Design a protein around this ligand. Structure first.
Ligand SMILES: N[C@@H](Cc1ccc(O)cc1)C(=O)O
Ligand SMILES: N[C@@H](Cc1ccc(O)cc1)C(=O)O
Lengths: 371, 371
């Protein structure tokens, strides 16, 4: 495969940022090892952002000849108080529910889960040489820098925060080097860990990434964070900064289940959630539904998306690019009522294999309900 | 032996503090395991405080039926930038110089080196389950608390301090629980780590100390910190808070080589150092020389300490208790000129076995001169 096609595969939506395209091209040209990974805390049900956005990139990376891996961060979740801070439950959930949920997500997004590596973090955390590297990295990062990085775990620096949470970010950086990751993939809210990884890369003594005598810097690839469906806390949004701050607060990972769609939600649950989603007529600056249409439905724009309607409401209309649908919506040619129903049906059909699997094999969801 | 005699062995000088006598007695009575340890950073010649005071307690503990251990804190020293942060050199020094230096110090203080366990920290730090306990402990301690415990490594919270240094205190606490330590021994400046250890003991999940169904709290035993021989930065010393403050600054571990006596110093170096030592006539509040007389020479009293003088200067005088000597000094009946000379000779004779060893086996000191 030509280098341009490989670079494009890495950069295409939903990726939002690559640090940096230059280093990525460099890695491709020198034949450096191409080891990817994206880590996940283990808590509740997998929402569309977690599953579909990561799944889409994993599929793209595979086609680019990059070795992909899903990292189940158990000790990290334990440190971050998930599942009541019960490590054993976290580990059971990771292996019986999360792993398969991700496989199914990767599958519907066009990737091959059989070719994706799955690592439970403890497989490497239980090794002392891993911790020696945590120390090695930590000697190169100021406490101040670590404190400003805790937002990667959806947390804010607060008085009385336990020390274990400060070790977390250093573990995330160590996870990259200990596994020889050259393609560090994550959602945009994890970028701070990757910025640190890139700056300490060439200073590491035990687990630097070495290729033909040179210490490499891993390439960071961040994908877009899908918005939750709830109405924002303020309206109208009055500044670019407000806009960015609100989107940060409104990301689906912080939404209540009623405003977040899960990969195995029922058709009825999907219709209901889209039904109450924030989607004001003609609004295109802040619109959760359009966000999903852009990043899920038009992931690959050389596509077709039809909204079926009676002639009285405009008749059937097929869009080929997100931009076309967006303008139609902004001009009042496409009503929320019809957009919501089309998105719901599209999702119901895309996620069908996932619902089916969790119906055929009921243990995973039984486990989640018991937690 | 009688529990009263066992308690007294733990309590005898140079012990300065025990947290707590009640828990210690409890441990003796219930027959809980008695595992001691005292850790040391690796970064220089062993001065009298390090060798003699620790050695004296190790000897006392052995007689009380406590299993003693010297913990060589290599990664800790690496983290704390000792020996230029060269872990390799730290490890060679620990095994080739420090270990044997301590063995001989324990021996001159009456302990049996052959019955003392010697553990290189990396022996346990190379184990991931040890780090799981570092995490477990860290979940029960706030960042602010760890920041406040930074003084145990001879540092103060700096604006740009590296993160690894904050991990150090949690490692010290973990070292205790991982080795099943019930008698945590250290100099008074390490007490903060032990107060935390006692606070989290019963909350630990992986390495609590369990005896007959109960989670135990280790007993902390702190020994007196011998002062360096240099004159104070200020004189006279006014307030009591100032007294403590200056003593913390003047402790031998922070003194220049010229104001600290090392276990292998030659007879001439010892005479020279005592000769210039701070020891104001009649001063008994702050006097490095009297400090050494009380904790070294009268470690066990009654004993016999004779100051030889010609009749014109009071003639020979033999003391049996520190109190008698102190009185004679306060009253100007014992002059610094004679006391200093007597302390030097006492030290020269006490340390002879050590000098003889390093004289016959020059490798250790040659290594030290090269670092
Ligand atoms: N910090 C990531 C999870 C993660 C954990 C460890 C890693 O190495 C990578 C990612 C999140 O909150 O989603
Ligand atoms: N902090 C101790 C060294 C030490 C390190 C680790 C321990 O577990 C105990 C002691 C000192 O400065 O001397």
């Amino acid at each position: 495969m030509d280098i341009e096609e490989r670079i494009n595969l890495v950069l295409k939506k939903p990726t939002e940022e690559v640090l940096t395209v230059e280093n990525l091209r460099h890695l491709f040209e020198i034949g450096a090892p191409l080891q990817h990974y994206i880590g996940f805390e283990i808590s509740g049900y997998i929402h569309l952002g977690t599953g579909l956005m990561a799944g889409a990139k994993i599929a793209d990376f595979q086609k680019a000849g990059i070795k992909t891996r899903v990292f189940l961060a158990d000790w990290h979740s334990w440190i971050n108080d998930k599942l009541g801070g019960d490590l054993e439950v976290i580990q059971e959930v990771a292996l019986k529910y999360f792993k398969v949920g991700m496989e199914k997500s990767i599958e519907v997004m066009g990737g091959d889960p059989k070719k994706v590596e799955f690592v439970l973090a403890s497989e490497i955390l239980e090794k002392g040489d891993y911790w020696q590297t945590v120390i090695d990295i930590s000697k190169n990062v100021t406490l101040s820098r670590v404190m400003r990085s805790i937002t990667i775990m959806g947390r804010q620096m607060g008085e009385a925060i336990d020390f274990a949470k400060l070790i977390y970010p250093m573990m995330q950086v160590a996870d990259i080097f200990y596994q020889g990751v050259t393609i560090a993939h994550a959602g945009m809210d994890q970028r701070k860990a990757h910025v640190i990884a890139i700056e300490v890369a060439q200073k590491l003594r035990y687990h630097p990434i070495v290729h033909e005598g040179e210490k490499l810097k891993p390439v960071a690839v961040h994908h877009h964070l899908l918005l939750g469906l709830q109405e924002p806390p303020k309206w109208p949004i009055e500044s670019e900064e407000e806009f960015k701050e609100i989107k940060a607060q409104m990301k689906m990972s912080k939404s209540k289940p009623y405003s977040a769609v899960f990969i195995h939600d029922s058709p009825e649950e999907i219709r209901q959630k889209l039904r109450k989603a924030f989607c004001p007529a003609r609004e295109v600056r802040y619109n959760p539904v359009l966000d999903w249409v852009e990043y899920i439905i038009f992931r690959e724009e050389p596509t077709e998306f039809t909204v079926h309607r009676p002639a009285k409401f405009g008749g059937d209309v097929t869009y080929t690019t997100f931009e076309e649908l967006k303008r139609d919506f902004a001009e009042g040619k496409l009503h929320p009522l019809d957009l919501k129903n089309a998105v719901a049906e599209y999702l119901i059909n895309l996620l069908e294999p996932i619902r089916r699997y969790f119906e055929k094999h009921p243990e995973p969801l039984e486990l989640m309900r018991s937690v």
